[model samples]
Target: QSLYREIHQLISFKDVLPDKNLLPDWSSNKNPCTFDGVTCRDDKVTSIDLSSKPLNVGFSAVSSSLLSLTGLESLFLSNSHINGSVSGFKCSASLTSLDLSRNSLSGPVTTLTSLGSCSGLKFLNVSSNTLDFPGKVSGGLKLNSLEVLDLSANSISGANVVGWVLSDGCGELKHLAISGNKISGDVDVSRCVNLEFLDVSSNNFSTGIPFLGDCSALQHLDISGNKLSGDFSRAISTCTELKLLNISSNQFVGPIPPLPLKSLQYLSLAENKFTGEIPDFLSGACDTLTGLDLSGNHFYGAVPPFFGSCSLLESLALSSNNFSGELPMDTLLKMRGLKVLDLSFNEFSGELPESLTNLSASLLTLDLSSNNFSGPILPNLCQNPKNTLQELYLQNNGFTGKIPPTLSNCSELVSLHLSFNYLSGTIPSSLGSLSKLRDLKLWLNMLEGEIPQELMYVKTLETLILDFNDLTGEIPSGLSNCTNLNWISLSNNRLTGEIPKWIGRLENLAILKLSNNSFSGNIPAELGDCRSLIWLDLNTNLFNGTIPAAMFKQSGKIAANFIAGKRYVYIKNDGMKKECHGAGNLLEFQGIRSEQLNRLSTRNPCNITSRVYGGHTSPTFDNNGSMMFLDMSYNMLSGYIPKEIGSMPYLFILNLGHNDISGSIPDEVGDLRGLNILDLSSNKLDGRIPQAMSALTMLTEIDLSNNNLSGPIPEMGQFETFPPAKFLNNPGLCGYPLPRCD
Candidate 1:
C-alpha cells in the first residue's frame, strides 16, 4: 500500500468538511515514514511538511499526487489554501525544497515552465501567491539548483522581472526575494554574482544603480520600497561584505554616502530623500553597528556626535526627523548596548533627563512618541533590573504626572503607550503587573479610576485602549479574563454598565469601541458570540432593547486567522458630510496619531487619507465573516431591523442611524452583498423601499432618512448615486435622488 494508497487517494476528500484525512496521520496502514507532514531519510518518504495545512485541494489537484513521491526531498506547501495551476507542475525529480508560499497559487511566468525539469531545484518559494508576469520569459529559470528564490508577494510584474530572473545562469543564485511585485526596470543583479540575500523591496524600481556586478559577495541588500533615485554610491561602494543595508522607502538623494561596510549590521535609510549629515563614514562603521533606521527623513542637526561611538548599538531609529534641540542625553547614554530607542516625530524638547535611567543595560524599545517631551513619567524608567522594557511609546508627549507605578518593573512589558499625555492619575493598578501586557494604551489622558481590575491579570491582553480618558466603572468583570482580546476601546469614558455578556467570551474580539460611553442595557444578544467580531462601535450609547436578532449570530463565523495581522485604519466615510457619523472609522493602527484619529467622539473630520490596512481582511471574499464595520448609531434601539441582518453577507458599514428602529426595512436588507454604507436613518422604518434593494451594488453611502421609509427609492444600484440628502425626511420617498416616482 505504498505510494501511500495513492497519497491517501490523492489527499482524502470523501466530501471534505474538516475530515477524511488529508494526511490525517496517513493511514495506508502506517509507516509512510509515519506520516503527518512526513519526513524520513533512509526510511524513504523524505520530507513533505504541509505548512499551515488546510490543503483544501487544487495545486493542480495535489500536483500529480505530490510529484509522485519517490523519495520526495522537501516539498512544503506554505499557508496551504493551495489553489491551482503551477502550469502542469512536475517538480520532484528529487525536489530539492519547493515551498509554494502562502498558497492560493496561480500561474504565469510560464508557471516556472514546469520548473524546467527540476534538475534538483534548490529551494524555490513561490511567495504570497497568485503569480503573474505575462509578457516574456521564453526560457531562463530552469531553477537549476536555484539557491533560494522567493518570488515575494506575487502577481509578479514584468519589465523583464529582473531579466526573467537572470535568464538562466545566476551562478547558483543565493537568496533572492523579489519583494512585493509589479517588478520594474533595471534592477540588474549583475549576474547575481553569487548574490547573497537581495530583496528587491516593494518593486517598481526606477532611478539608478546602473549595474551592481562586482558586488563582491554582497551580504543582504534590500533596495527598499522603490522609485529608487540617484546616488547609490557607485552601485553601493562595492559591497565590501555589506551586512544588511536597506535603502528604505527610496528616491535616495544627496549626502549620506560612504557606507564603509566593515561588516555593517542592519542599516535602514528610512523614507529617503537622504540629505546631509551622519556620514563620517557612518562613524566609521560603528564597529559593526547594529540596527540603525534613519526614520522618514530631512534629518536635522545634532545626533551624530559620533553617535557615542556606536559600541555595537542595538536599534536606534530617528523617527520623522527634523530632529531639533535637547535630547542627546549626552549622546544617547553612550550606547551601552542600547536596545531600541526610537525618537518619534521630533522637535525633541528636553526633560527626559535623570540620565534617562542610565539607559541601555539592554533597554528594550523606548519610542519617545510624537514629541516636545516634557517631564515626569520617570520612575527611573524601569531602572534596569534587567527588566528589558518591551515597547514603551510615550504617546504624543509633553508628558506630565501619574500612571507610573514604576511600570510594574518592566517584566518584559509588551507595548504600553501612555497616550497623549498631560497624564493625570489612576488606572495604573500597577499596570496589572504587566504579565507580558499586550498593549494597554492609556488613551488621550487625564485618566481616571476604575476599569482596572488589575487588568485581569494581563492574560496577555490584546489591546484594550482606553478612549479619551476620565474612565469610570463597569465593564471590567476582570475583563472576562481577556481571552486575548483583540481591541476593545472603551470610548470617551465615564463608562457605565451593561455591555458585558462576558463580551461573548471575547473570542479574539475584533474592534469593539464602546462609542462616547455611558453604555446602558440591552444590545447584547451576547454580541453574537464574538467570533472575531469585526469593528462594531456602539455609537453614542444608552442602548435599549430590540436590535438584537441574537445580533446576527456569528454571521459568517469570523476568523481570518482572527483579524489577520492586526494594524488597521479603515476611516472611509466620504459620505459627503451630515456631520460625518457612521460608515467608516475603524482605527486601531498601532503607534497611534493619525492626527489623533480626529480626537474621536466617534471620529469625523474627513479629507479621507487612510492607509494602514494590514495583512488579512477580506481575501477577495468567501465571507471571512463580513461585518466590516457596524456602528449601532446613536442608540436607544427599538425593534425590527434584523432579518438576521441578512446573515451579514459581508456587510460593510451598516449603521442603524439614530435608532428607534421599527419594522419593514428588511427585505433581508437585500442580502447585503458587500453593502458599502447603508444607514437606516432615524428609524421606525415603514414599508416598500426594497426592490430587493437593487442588490446594493456596493452603495457608497445610503441613508434612508427619517425613516418611515415609504415608496419608490430603490431603482437600481447605488441608489441614484446618493445625494438628495440621502433621501431626507423620507416623506414617501420618490426616485432618482428624490422625486421621480410618479
Candidate 2:
C-alpha cells in the first residue's frame, strides 16, 4: 500500500495515462503483479519494466520513494523522462539490472559515486541522459559487482577518467560503452581483462586504447571517432575471438596490422592517416572477414590481391585513397558473394573491367565516383534475373560516351547518380520510367537536346540535379507532376525560355538554382506560392524583371540549402568563368565567418572574388520561415528591392549588384538584424548611402563600387571598414576610403 502512494507522488500519471497503457490495472485493491510494468513472484514485487514508457517522474521521488522497494531485483525505465537530481539515491539491496537509457536525469559530474550503495547491481545503462562528469580524478570508484555499464550520449566529460586511479568498479565488468562523451586523456582499461564488449568511441581520448589484458574473450570493440593514435600490432596479435572492430575517423597512423584468423569478421579503419600499399597483413583477416572499410585514408598503390585468399567477403570499401591504375578485376571476380563495392575518389584511370556486368546479380550498391575511369557504362549493367542493384553512383569521372539505356533493366534501383563526366548525347527517356527512382542526378556533362518530359512517369522524383549541361529548351512542364521535388538545379546551361509558374504550385521546392542560363522573363510572382523555398539563386542569367514582394510573406522560416550531388564548376563558353562569384558572395561568406569578411575579397585571386567548397559543419535551420539569403544580382532586374525584405530578420546578404535597379537604399534595411555582405555594385541606384545600415553588427563586405550614390560616407560602423575600390567609380560618392568629400 505504501508503494502505491509512492507511485502517485513520483509520477504525474495524468500525462502517461492518455494512452490507457501506463500502469493500467495498478491499484492497492489488488496485488501489484496485476499492474502493467510490474512483476511479482511469491507475492512480492520483484521486477519493474517501464522500459519505453514515460513515468514523468522526478529524480528525487524515484530515489526517495521508488528505491525503497527492497524486494525489487530488476528495474527498466529506459525512456521515463525523469528529471532533477538525487544525492541520496539508495537503490534496492536486491537490484541487479537497472536501465534509464533515455531520460532527462541530470546531476553533478561526480554523481556516480552516490550510486556506490548499489553493491549488488550488475548491469546499469544510463545512456542518452544529461549527466555531468568530473574534470580530474578523485577518490576510489565503487559499484564492484557491475558487469555491464553504458554511459553513451551524455555530458559526462573528464580527463583521465575510467583509469583505476579514478575508478575501480570494473573487477567483474565484461561490457562497457562510454561513447559520445567528452571524456579526454589516456584510457587505461588493462584491469578490465574480462570485458567482452567495449565501445569508447566518439570521445577525445588522445592516447590509444591500451590492451585488454585478455583478448581471447573480447568480442566487439569500437574505439572509432576519437583521437587515439598507435600501431595496433599488439591489439591484433592475440585476437582469439574478437568479432567486430571499428576504429574509423581517428588519428591512428601505421600500416594495416595483421590480425588473427578468428578476429574481427567486420573491420573498419577508415578516415585515418594509415598509408602504404594495401598490406599483406590483411590477408589473414580476409579469410574470416565478411566486411572491410579502408576509405578516407592515404592507402596508395593498386588494391592488393589479398582478397583472393578469402571467399566470404561481402562488402569492400577503399574510396578516397591514392590508389591508382585499374581495378584488380581478377581478384574481385573471385569474391562471388561481394554485394557492396566502393572505389570512389581514387586516381584509377582507363575503362572498367567488363566483368562488372556479371556482378549485378547480387550487387546492392556500387560507388565508383571521382575517378578517371573513361568509357561507356555497361550496356548489360543490371540485366539479370536476380538483379538487386539499388544505389549506383558513378559520378565525377572521365567516363565518356552515352549512358546506356539498358540501365532501365534495374527496376529496383532507387538512386542513379552519373554527373560530372564527359558523357554526350541525350538522356535516355527510359530512365524516367523507373518508377522506384527517387534521385536523378546528371549534371556537368556534354549532353545536349531537350529534357525528356516523360520524366513525369516517376512521380517519386524528389531531387532533379541537371545543372551545367548544354541542354536546350525550358524546364519541361511535366516536372509539374513531380510534386516531390525539393531541389531543382538547372544552372550553367543553354536552357532558354521563361520559367514556368507551375513550379510554384509544387510547394515542396526548397532550393531553386536557375543561374548562368539564357532564361528570359519576369521573375515569377507565383514563386511566392512556394512556401518552402529557402535558397533562390538566379544570378548570371538573362532574367529581365523586377523583384517580387510576395516572396517575402513567409520570410521567417530559415532553411538550409541542401545539395544532392556535388557542386560542379561553371566555365561558360562565352570565355568567362561563370562560377567566379557567389550570391553577393553570400555562399562564400559561409565558412569564412570566423575570419573577418572584408579582407578576404581583396586578398583573393583576380578572377575569383569568393569561392566556397569543402569544410565547415552543415548549417542548422529552424521553422521560422525567414529568408536568409537574397541575391538577385547580375540580371536585368530593375526596380526597388522590396522593403518587405527588411522583415526577413534572418537575411545575412542582400546583393543587387550588376543590375539596372534604381532607387535609394531602403532605410528599412536596418531592420535586418543579421544583415551582412550587402552588395549594390554596378547598378543605376542613386542617393546618399543609408546611415541606418550601421545597425547590422555582422556586416563584413559591402560592394557599392559602381553606382550614382552621392554624399559624404558615414564612418560610424562597417562603412569605414571597406577598401577604396568598394567605393570607386561612384560618380558622386565621397568617403574615407576615397579622398575627403569636396
Candidate 3:
C-alpha cells in the first residue's frame, strides 16, 4: 500500500482520479517509477512528470507528499494545470531546471528567499503565470544564474526592466522575455551580448528604442505593442546578426534608415505612423527577407521595384496604406518563392497585369481585396497545381466579368472570397473539383443562376455565404454530402424551394441564414437533428408550421464568440437605411463595434465587404454557450414558444418578431442569463414576463410590443431600462419604464 498511499492522497483531493479503477501495474517492491508520472531510483522518487494530463489540481496533496523530499536535481511540471507554488520543492542540493510553464503558480519565478536553498539554478520557465520578478521593485532579478528566463504573460512590474537584465548575474542570459507586462521606462540591453532572444512586447517602454550597444549575437528581438517611436535603424544597425525583428503596433515614424543587414529573414513595421516612400535600405535587404509586412501605415507611392527581386520572399502584407500606381508586371515574374501576397485596403488602381498567372504556381494565399484593380477574373488565377493554392480573396474590388470556371484547377482551395464586386455570372460547377474547400463567399454580387449541385462533393466545406445575389433555383438537394458544414448564408436571393429535409443531418450546422427568399413549404420538424444549430434565420419566407420543439433538443456548446465563417468588413451606418428591419444589419458581419466603424468614403471605401481570416479553417470559439444569437423575424410562421429554449445558457440575442406565434410566453426563457437582446414583438403572446428574466443582467435592448402580454413589468434588472414603446399594446402590462402598471 506504499504507492496506494500516494494514490489515496491524490484521490482525496478531487480531480486527480479520472476513473474508479486502480490498476495492478505497480507495487511498492517494484521501482516507484512504475507508477504513471512517478519516477524513482534506489527507492527514492527522483522525477515526477505528468504533462498534458487532466489532473491539474490543488497543490496541498502533492506538496506535502512528493515535493517535501529532496535528492534529485530536476523537476518537470510543464502544463500540468496545477496551482499554488513550488514552495515545498526541497529537491537536491543543486536544484536546477524548473519548468512550471502555463500553470497557475502563485509566486515569483525565483525570489532571493525562495531560491536561497537551491545552490545551482540554470533553466526556469514560469511563463503564463501571475508570478512577478522576485525583487520586482528592488531593481534586480535575484536569480541570475539562469541561462533561460521566461517571465512572459505575468505582472512582473514596478521597476524599469533594464536595471535587472543589465545586472551582474544576468550576463549570460540567453532567452529573456518580459512580454505582456506593464513594465515602463527606457530600455537599453546591449550588454548581455550573448542574449539571443529578447521579447519585451506589450509594455510601456516609451521614448526611443533600446540602443543595444555593440549588438551582434541577438537573433530575435520583439519590442512591439509599445509607444516607442523613431530612429529604428539607429539601434538595430548594431545587431546586424538579427534574423527576425517585429516592431509592429507601435508609434513608429520612419525615414530611410540604413538597414544594411541583408541576412535578415523576417521584418514587420505594421500598424504604425510611418511616413515615407519605400525605403531604399530594404531594397538591399530583400535578398534574404522571406517575410515582410508594412501594412496599416502611411507609406505611399508604388511598391518598391526591389520586391520582384526578392528571390526567397514568401509573404508580403502591404494592406491598408496609400500605395498607388500600377504594379510592375515584368518584375513580379521573378518572385518564385512568394507564397502569400496581401495588397488589400489600398488605393492601387490598375488592370491586373497578365503576369498574374505566373504567381499562382506556389501561391497559397492571394489577398488583393479592396484594391482598384479592374478586370474579369481570368483562368490564370488558378492555373497552378491543385495541391498548393489554399485561399483566394479578391472581394470588394472593381473587377467585373464572369465567374471563372478555370479556377477549378486549384483543387486545394479552402476559402474563396469574391463578394462586393461588379462581376456577373453563374457560379462555375467545375469548382466542385476543389474537394478541400471549406468556405465559399460570393455575396453582394450580380451573379445569377442556380447553385451548382456539384458543390456537395466537398465534404470539408464548413461555411457557405452567398447573399444578395440573383441566384434563382431550388436549394440544391445534394448538400447532404456536405455534412461538415457549420454555417450557411444564402439570403436576399431569388431562390425558391422547400427547406430540404437533408438539413436535419447537418449535425455541425451552427448558422443557417436563408431569409428574403421565396421558399414555400412546411418547416421541417426533422431540423431537430441538427444539435449544434444556433443561428436559424428563415424570415420573409413562405414557411408555415408550429415551431418544432425538437429543434431545442440538441442545445449544447453553441459557441458564438466569433462570427463564424468568412471575415467581412461593414460600414456601421453605410449608405442610408434602405430597407433594413432586423435588430441589426443583416450582412456578412465579421466582428466590430459601433464606436469605431470604417466609414465608406473616397479614401477608405469598398474594401471589406466580407473576407476570410487568413486561411483559418479552425473553430474560433473562445467561450462556451449553448446558443448566442437566434433570429426568425419577418416570417409567416405560426407556433408556440418552445419551453426547451430555457436550456440555452448563454444566448446573446433572440428575435421572433413579426411572427404569428401564439400561446403564452414560456417562463423557461429566463434560463438564458447571458442574453443581451430580446425581441418578441408582433407576436400573439398572452402571458406576464417571467421574474426569471431578471437574471438577464446583460440585456441592453428588449422589444415586447404588440404582444398580448398582461401583468406589471418586472422592474428589477435590465427590464427597467426599456422604453414605453417596448411594452406598447400590452393592455394588461404596466411598469416604470412603460406606463406604470395600473
Candidate 4:
C-alpha cells in the first residue's frame, strides 16, 4: 500500500482536486497494473510514463515526493510543465532511467549533482529546460552508471559542464549530447574511452576543435553550428568507426584534408570558409558514403571527375559555391543510386542534356535553381516510367520553351517551381492532371492565355503564383473546387472580369494578390467570408464600388496562427516620394532576389526612402482578428470609411489612398491599438480629427493628404509626428507639425 500511497501523493500536486482521477485509469478500485501509465511487475509499481501530460506542478513536488518512490525503476515526465528549481532533487536508488525533458525546470547546471543518489541510473535526459552554468561544480556529477545523458537546449554555459559531467570518469559514459547551449573554451573528450556518440553543436566553442582522444568506438559526432577552428583531420584521426560527422556552419578555413574514414556514410561540411578544388580523397570512401554536402563554401572550379565513381551516393549537394563550367552529364549519370541532387547558386552554365531524365528511378528532389544554365526546357526531365520525382526546382535560369506537357507524368510531383525563367507559351493543361501537385510558381515568365480550368482537378493545390505574366481572361470559376488554396498571386497580368464570388468559400485562403490587373466590377462582399484572409492587395485595378462593411465582419473570428511563420517582405511607404504609391506592399520573399522587387510597377526604382521589413510575418495579438494588410489604393473604390473597421484590433496596415472614397474618418479608427501605418490620402474626407485616436500609440506612419478634411490634427498621438506634407492639400488642417489651429 505504500507504493500506491506514494503514487497518490505525486498526483495530489496536479493543481486540481481528486487529482488521481485525472488519469482515468488510475482509480482507487482498480489494480495498479490496470493504471494507464503505470507499469507493475510482481505486484509492485516499477515504472511510470507521464510523457506529454499537462501535470501542472512544481519541480519541487516531483523531486520531493515522486523521487522518494522506493522501488520505482524508471520515470518519464517530459513536457509536463513542471517548474521550479531542481537543486534539491534526490532520486531513489532503484531508478535507472529518468527523463524530465521539455519541462520548465530551472536552476544551476551544477545542481544536477543531487542525482548522485541514483547510483544505478543509466539514462538521464533533462533537455529543453532553464538550467544554466553559473560557475564551477563543487563535487561534479558523480553518476558512475550514466551511459547516456542528454542536456541539450538549455541555458548551460561554459565548457566546465562538460568537465563536470565527464569528471566523474568517462569510462562508462557512451552517449552524451550538450548541444544548443553557450558552452565555450577548450573541449577535451579524450578521456571518454567508450564514447560512441557526442553532439556539442550550436554552441559558442572556439579556439580549436575538441580533442577526441582515441575514440575508436565513436560512430556519430556532430560539432556543427559552433565557432571552432582547427585541423579537421587531426581531431578524427583515431575515430575509424565514425559513420556520421557534421561540422558545418563554423569558422573552419583552408582546404579539407584527406578523410581516410572508410566507414563514414554521411558527411556535411557546409557553411564554412573551406577553399580550393574538390579534394579527390573524398571519393576514397565513396564506396560507403551515401550522403555528402559541401554547400555554402568558397570551393571553386569544375566538379572533379572522381564523383562519377560514387555510385553508392543517394543525396549530393554542392550548392552556393563558385564551381563553374558545364555539368559533366556523362559523369553524373554514372551515379545510378542518386536520389537528391542540389547544385543551386553556382555559376554552372550549359544546356541540360536531353538524357537528363535518365537519372536514377529513386530521384525525388532535383534543385538546379539560381544557375547560369540556358536552353529550352526539354521534355525528358520527368520521363521516368516509375515516376518518383516529388520536387523539381529549376527557377532563376534562362530555360526557354513551353512548359512540357509530359511533366504531368510525374505522378508524385508536389512542388514545381519555374519562376524567373525566360520560358514562354501557354501553361499546359496537362499539368492539372498531377493529382498530388501543391505549389506551382510560374511568375516572371512570358506565359500567355487563360488559366486552365483543368487545374481545378488538383484538389491538393495550395499555392498558385502566376504573377507578371501575359495571361488574360477571368479567373477560372472552376478553381473554387481547390478548397486547400492559401496563397494566390496573379498580379501584373492582363486578366479581366470581376472576381468570382465563390472565392469566399476557400476558408484556408490567407493571401490574395490580383493587383495591376484590368479586373472590373464591384468588390465582392463575399471576400469577407474568407476567415483566413489577412493580406488583400487589389490595387491598380479598375474596380468601382463602396468599401464593403462585411469585410470587417470576420474581425475577431479569423484564425490566428495560419500566416505567422511564412517568409515575406513588407515595404512600408515613407510618403516622401510622390511617384511611389500605396501604404505598403507585402511580397512572398522566399527564393526571391532583392533586386527583383524593384521590377514591380508599384515600386519606384528611383526612390530609396521606403523602409523594408523582411522576415517571417507574425500576428501581434494572440486571439482576436484583424487584416494585417489591406491595400485598395490606386483604384476607383468609393464610399465612407466603414466604422466596422474599428472592430479590427490587430490591423497592422490600412491603405485606402488614391480612391474615390468620400466620408469623415470614423471615430472607431482609434480602436486599432496595433495599427502601424494608416493612409487615407487623395480621398474626399471632411471632418475634425477624432479625439479617440490618442489610443493609437503604435502608429508610426500616417498620411491624410489631398483630402478636404478640416480640423486641428489629433495632438494626442503620433499624428503630429509626421511632416506638414503628410497633412498637405487640406487647407484647414493645423497641428503641431502642421501650423497651429486658430
Alpha carbon lDDT at 45, candidate 4: 75
Q: What is the per-residue lDDT of model 2 for residues 1-742, given as tens digits with 9 covering 90 to 100?
A: 5456434532434233444346666643465666677787876778878767666777666665556577678878788777776565667688888787889878754565576677688888888999876545676556667888888998978877667322765668889888998888776666776878888899888866656666767788788988878866586567578898898999888777766656668989899999888877778776688999999898889878878766788999999888898878778878888889899888788887887777887788888877768888878787665678888988877788888898888887898888767789988999887888988888767888888889999888887877667789888889999987877877767899888988788777877877667888988888777766766778777788788888777677545454323333321111135435445222211101222222223322214424333443233455575666666667888987677768877677677778898888777887887886787888887888778877778887778888878887777877778788888888788879887887
Ranking by lDDT: 4, 1, 2, 3
Using TM-score as the yardstick, the better of models 1 and 2 is 2
Q: What is the C-alpha lDDT of each candidate?
A: 0.76, 0.74, 0.72, 0.82
Q: State how far residue 666 of model 2 sits from its true place (Å).
A: 1.9
Compute the lDDT for candidate 1: 0.76
Model 4 error, position 460 (Å): 1.3
TM-score of 3: 0.84
Q: Give the number of the best model, judged by TM-score.
A: 4
Model 2 residue-pair collision total:
9
Error of 4 at 690 (Å): 1.9
Residues 1-742, candidate 3: write the lDDT tens digits.
5455544433443334343233234343455556766667776556666565545565554455444345545667677677776553443464566677777777664442354345566777777877666554454556667777777887767456656655655677788888898787767676677888889899877777876787778889899999887787878877868999999999887644666455789988899988888876577776788998999898888877777778888988998888887765576668788888888777678778776876787788888777777888876765645437788888877779899998888877888888777779899998788888887888777899999999888888888888878989999997898988878888878899888988988878877888778887767877777766766777667777777777666566454433445443322212233244454433454311221233222212323343212322233344454655677777777878889867777577788888888888788877787787888989889988988788778887788999888997887878877778888998899887877745
Identify the runs in model 3 with alpha carbons over 4 angstroms from their true place: 1-27, 31-49, 54-75, 86-96, 109-120, 133-136, 384-387, 556-579, 589-624, 645-647, 667-672, 683-699, 707-724, 727-742
Structural RMSD, model 3:
5.5
Cα-based TM-score, every candidate? 0.33, 0.88, 0.84, 0.94
lDDT of 1 at 107: 66
Q: Write the per-residue lDDT of candidate 1 for residues 134-169, one digit (tens) a residue.
A: 776566665646878888998887776776677767
Model 4 stretches with alpha carbons more than 4 Å out: 1-18, 41-44, 63-71, 87-92, 571-580, 595-613, 617-622
Residue 665 displacement in candidate 3 (angstroms): 3.5
- Say which prediction, candidate 3 or candidate 4, comes out ahead on TM-score: 4
